[PDB]
Each structure stands twice: as C-alpha cells, then as structure tokens.
Symmetry: C3
Subunit: 275 residues, 3 copies
Amino acid sequence: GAAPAGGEVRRVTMYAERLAGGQMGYGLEKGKASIPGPLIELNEGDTLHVEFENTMDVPVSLHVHGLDYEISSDGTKQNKSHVEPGGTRTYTWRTHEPGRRADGTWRAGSAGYWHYHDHVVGTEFGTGGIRNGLYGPVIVRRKGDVLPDATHTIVFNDMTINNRPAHTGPNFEATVGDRVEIVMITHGEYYHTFHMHGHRWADNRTGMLTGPDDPSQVIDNKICGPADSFGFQIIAGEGVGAGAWMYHCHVQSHSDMGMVGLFLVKKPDGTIPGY
Amino acid sequence: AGAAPAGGEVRRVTMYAERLAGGQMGYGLEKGKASIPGPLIELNEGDTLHVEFENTMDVPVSLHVHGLDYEISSDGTKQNKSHVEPGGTRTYTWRTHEPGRRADGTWRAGSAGYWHYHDHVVGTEFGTGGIRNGLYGPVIVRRKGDVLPDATHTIVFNDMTINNRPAHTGPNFEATVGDRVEIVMITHGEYYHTFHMHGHRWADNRTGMLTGPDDPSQVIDNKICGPADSFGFQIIAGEGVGAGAWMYHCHVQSHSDMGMVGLFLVKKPDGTIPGYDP
Amino acid sequence: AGAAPAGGEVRRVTMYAERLAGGQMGYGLEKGKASIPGPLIELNEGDTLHVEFENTMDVPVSLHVHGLDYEISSDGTKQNKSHVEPGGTRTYTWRTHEPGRRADGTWRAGSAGYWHYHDHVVGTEFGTGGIRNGLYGPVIVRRKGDVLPDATHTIVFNDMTINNRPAHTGPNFEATVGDRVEIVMITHGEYYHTFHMHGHRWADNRTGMLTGPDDPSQVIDNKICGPADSFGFQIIAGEGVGAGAWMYHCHVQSHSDMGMVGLFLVKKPDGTIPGYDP
Ligand SMILES: [Cu+2]
Ligand SMILES: [Cu+2]
Ligand SMILES: [Cu+2]
Ligand SMILES: [Cu+2]
Ligand SMILES: [Cu+2]
Ligand SMILES: [Cu+2]
Ligand SMILES: [O]
C-alpha cells in the first residue's frame, strides 16, 4: 500500500443535482449525489478532466483548491466558467511533482488534502451552494505515500457536520489496528477546533512525522476556518484500545449543540467495550 | 542546559475537585488546596500516572486529558460512564509512549508536548459549565533530552478572562534577565484569540525553539488559538531587549481593551524594573 | 533578482504620522506622503534601524513593532511612557540579530520574518482607534541568502476591509507570468479571516517556500489568520496555471460577499490577460 508515481490522464463525469429539502449535491452518476460529494484522488503528475453537467434549474460551478488549473477552469462567474442550467463543461485539473526550478528554488508539489465546491449558487462566492451541500474532498498523493485501509471525510459546514441534523454524527466504524485516514474540511461562516478522543496526529502534510527529525507539532486539537483543509492517518485504538472514541468541535456551544460524532473502534470480535 | 531524562516511572497522585469562592471550581493535589488553573502535571515520555480522583462537590464531575494515552474507561465522559458522582472516587490512568518505528515502516509519534486536562461533565456533557467554573489544568510531557526551564507559567484564555481573573488583573509573572522561562498557553470556551508577547518570540513547533539551523518552523510573536488549543515554548527572559514590564495580551482589539492583558515583569539582576510602578 | 546580504549596518529613516482624508491616519517616510498600509521597511538580520518619528497630528500617537528587538523605551506604549505627544518627536530604535548557538547549547532564533508595526495609543491604550484609522505597515527582516523578489505587495485584512479600502475595490496587483511575487499578509482588528489565493499556493513556513525535499512544512492555498498575525510568501506568477485574473479573497463567506476581494492580474509577455472582462 504505497502510492505510485502519477502521470495518467484520467476522466470523470460529475453532476450537480438537487437533493431533498433544498439541499444540492455532487455525484459521479445522476441520482447519486452525496453530501459531501465523491472523493477524488490522484497521484502527483496526474491530469483529471471532469466532464461536468448541471442538472439543476439554477447556475452552478466547480472550483478546486490546491490543484493546477488555468483560468478557463476557474469555475467562477467572474471568469465566465460557471455552468448554465442543463449545461455541460469540461473542467481540467492538473498536478505536478515537486522539483528544483531553473532559478534554483524548490517548487512545492501538488500533494495534499484539498477540496472542491460551488462558486456561483446564491452569491458569486458560492455561499448558497456551499450551504446547500456542494462540497467534496480531493486527495493528491505523493509517490511512496502510505495508503490507508479507509478514508472518511468530515466537513464542518457552519454548525453542522456534513449538513446532518444536530446530534446525528456521522459515525465511522473501524477495527483496532486499522490504518484510518481522515479528511477534514471547514466551510461557511465560523471558526472551529476539531478534536479527537484517544488519538493524535502531526500538523503537517500527511499527519505523520517523517521520522525522528520532523519538528512538526503533534496535536489532537486543530483550529480551522472556512475553506481550510487538512488530513491525517492514525492507527485505530493505537495505545488506547477499543471503544466509542468521540470526535467533535471543541468550541463549547458547538459540541453542546451537536457537532459531535463517534469513531467506533471494534475489538477483533466486533464488540465495542462500554458502548 | 539541564535536560529531561528518559521516562518509564509509574506514578500515583491524589486529586480532588473542590468548590471555590465565587461559584468557581478547581482541581488540586491536596484537600483545601485546589487552584485555577489546576496543578501543573509533569511527566517524562513513557511515564504512567494513576490519578486517585475524589469529587467533593454536589454535582458529578470528571477528568479528561488531551494528547496522552488512556483507555476508554479513563475517557472521563458521562458517555462512556467515566464521570464521578458527588462524593465519589475513581482512579484515572494516563500513559505515555516514546516515538518509534512501526512494522509498516511509518514513524509513530510520541506523547511529548504541551497538553491539558479539564472537566467533561459539569453543566453539559462537554464540561462547558465546569470549564467556565475553572476546572482546567496543564500537562507537560517531556521527551528525553528536552531542555528544562528555570520556571513554568500557565496562561489560560478562558472565554474573555485570563485564568478566570477579573479584567486588568494580570496575572503578572516575574523573572530576571537571562532566566529560561517556559510558558504553557491554553485556550478554552467559545471565542478565538491571538496570544501576543511584547519583546519576545518563539518557534511555532513542539518545544517553541528551533532544533538547529535546518529547522524551518516559523518564528512568531502572535499565535491564533481556539478552544482547547494548547501550545508552549521557552524564552530567555529579556534576551536582546533588556529588563522592563513586558505586556502579554490577546491581540483581538476589544479583548485587550476590555482586560485580557498581563505583565511579564523582567527584572535586572538587582531586582528592579526600569520605568515601572509596582 | 539576487539574494539578501548579511546585515549589520546602522540605519536612519524619518517617519511621520499624518491625518488623511476621511478621518484616516497614516504613516509615511516623507511629509505629505503618508499611505495605508504604511511604507514597507526592509532590514537584513543584524541591521539596526533608528526611526526619527514625528507626530504631526493633534492627538497622541505611537509606533510599536512586532518581531524585532527593542528596548523597553521603544515599546511604543503609553503604559511605558513611549508614545509621542501632539507635535512631538521621538527616536524609536529597532535592532535585529542573526540566529546562532547559545552558550548553554541551545539555538537562538534569528529576527528574520514577515513582521509589522502599528499604533498603540490612538483611541485606546491598545491603539484600537489608530489601527482602525490605518496606522499599520509591513516590516521584512531577511536572512542572509534569502531569495529577493521582483515585487512586494502588502495585503492587510483590517476588520472587514482590505487596506482600509471600500468593499469590492481591490486592491488589484499586476504581474507578468514568471515574475517572482512576494506577498506580505497582515490581519488587524476584531475578526478572524481565512486568506485564499486562486491559482497559487505556498508553504506555511517563514519564507513561504519549501527549503527543499526534506522540508515537511504544509503546502496550502488558504490560511486562517487573526488580529496582528503576519505571514508572507513568494510565488511564481501564473506558475503552472498561466495568465488570468486570479482572485484573492477572504474565504469566510459573508466577508467575500461583502467586500474582501481583490485581483492578482497576471499578464502574458504581450501584456494581455485572457478573458479578463470587468
Ligand atoms: Cu465549531
Ligand atoms: Cu474555495
Ligand atoms: Cu481574545
Ligand atoms: Cu478537551
Ligand atoms: Cu474575513
Ligand atoms: Cu501589535
Ligand atoms: O473560493
């Protein structure tokens, strides 16, 4: 389980659809929109052509963080790269490996925990579409990056997690020992502090120290604001064992009002103690 | 300088939750000795700590810890039946570990860092009322080799207060030029803050100081922080700037205007402070 | 083009505080040419700056700097008798230093970084009124060997404004594809912000560039920031993405909706911007 060298041109169809009760979501297939939208992952060097269709009765767009795009795939009304109702457009995202420039400085690669979202619904900064649920995670991996057993996306969108009703999680299940990858994105109006019980991570690209010389901070509590994105991998229950491990925003009124879910770590027989 | 040793001791300490003057509540290591912030707990990586906990209050209370190892039975949440009924007792166990290699080739981070414990049960199932009342405290886990300070001070931005104190009442912390001073900085509650120190700066990393010339960590004097963030650092008091009454404060402008200010009082060897009135 | 030299020279500038139209206030290096942000001040580690300061206004004002070394007499605070009366003058003295090894074996962090200065006295004793009015500016301290830019631009999030400008009025900055553009980014006031740049990214470290393949610093295009935070980076204009009208904005949704947006206009060599249609 280690990511390869990138460099493939790949193609994906994507759709924007209305969901129940005023919401809106991205999907890989019509009738399959989700909140958050589909996970996209790539290897540094890959190119991705998103053959995008707006099935909605209002204009919509797709704007991505981190990845390379020319201005024609900005996905903004300002640069006239939104999609009209019933319309179709191909968005192109590219990625690159790190390397030394001609001027001698080091050019950072595209790898990271990134995300895409709408930019034109409600306002010309996508305020309505993001509130409605038009956001999704993008993982760009670097060659040799350790691959996880599972990937789970947690989005703090105003006072919700993934636009869900308060105090309804979501929960994620794992088994003690699993290598679990979390992708953490924030949207909207408020700052938050994402906290996990039982587990901790490095505040750097991959969430893991690169070895004994990495001076990165090891934390279990990270402040974050609109359009911030980070990720990390942990070994479930490592050093702490099985249980219902809570994650939540640590802003006191936010947890109290429902920004909480469970990381359910099972013992090899499936049981979870005290839960 | 003096350095932390390797860890591995199994330790035991009694702790109590007591009601304090003015609606407050605090932790302490001996009866009648609770404080806000609670007592500084110091461990070397690999140490174990058994907290024999006693709740002397009329409300359930708990003890939850950041960053350290613990099993689900020491979660300190009502959700996993780990709170302490009024008058009750419970042994909370925290463990730590050193960094090292896993079979998968990845590096496992250690427990070292600037952590903190708080209540999870008073007021709400997230300790909102308990934190407000003052049930928080710092925990430092040291890695083998860490430089040891001449003194450690704990600054906690709890909502609009520093350490639950009234506006414009510090706390003030005294040192002499040349002292190696360790700040532990915790934030709690509802609001974001930015911690700023006049005349001093630190590295935004684990220890607060650069490991050497190849360390790319940013050097700052202003750090945004939100509820349950904890970071720490060590500075040489007055290094390159001299003695005097050096302000620390939140840099959110209405927060400093309203009293989130204290004084780092750096003295000359003779104990005086140039241009300052006690 | 080129690289920062080793610092060490003693320097002089005159700085003025002036009233500006619309109730604003600004600093400048020459009378009648105050600006918001204030004039950019550049030093190399080890340089000393003597600022002969004149307050041309009818209320007290001060000059306080982040990051740099100063004695308590150059704190710029009323609290330490370091403000300037109406009509008065005062020499503020800033020092900087190189990184190095201390006697007790630890590494002293240098002064290099993206810093800033601002008033501490107009409105409140934390300069709440001066900062609102526009009394802030950038200070760069470079390390020996730092790459130098083609151009430097200062972007200041001051409450719900950029550089005290009306909503949706920029500023816009122009480059040519391939230009090495430095950004100095400073936040002031009451609110937290998230600084976002379309089509470009940087490392969240001191220089904003990874020191090499061993640098673990995060790469981002969105940084949370709060009052008195300062960071900076250098980017290659259009690098890997080309020409266009690339927006930068605050990504807090209502903040962008209500004005906190500008444009990084990157031009082809012939000077055109494809599909720029204002
Ligand atoms: Cu929150
Ligand atoms: Cu965005
Ligand atoms: Cu504050
Ligand atoms: Cu907590
Ligand atoms: Cu903003
Ligand atoms: Cu300041
Ligand atoms: O955006």
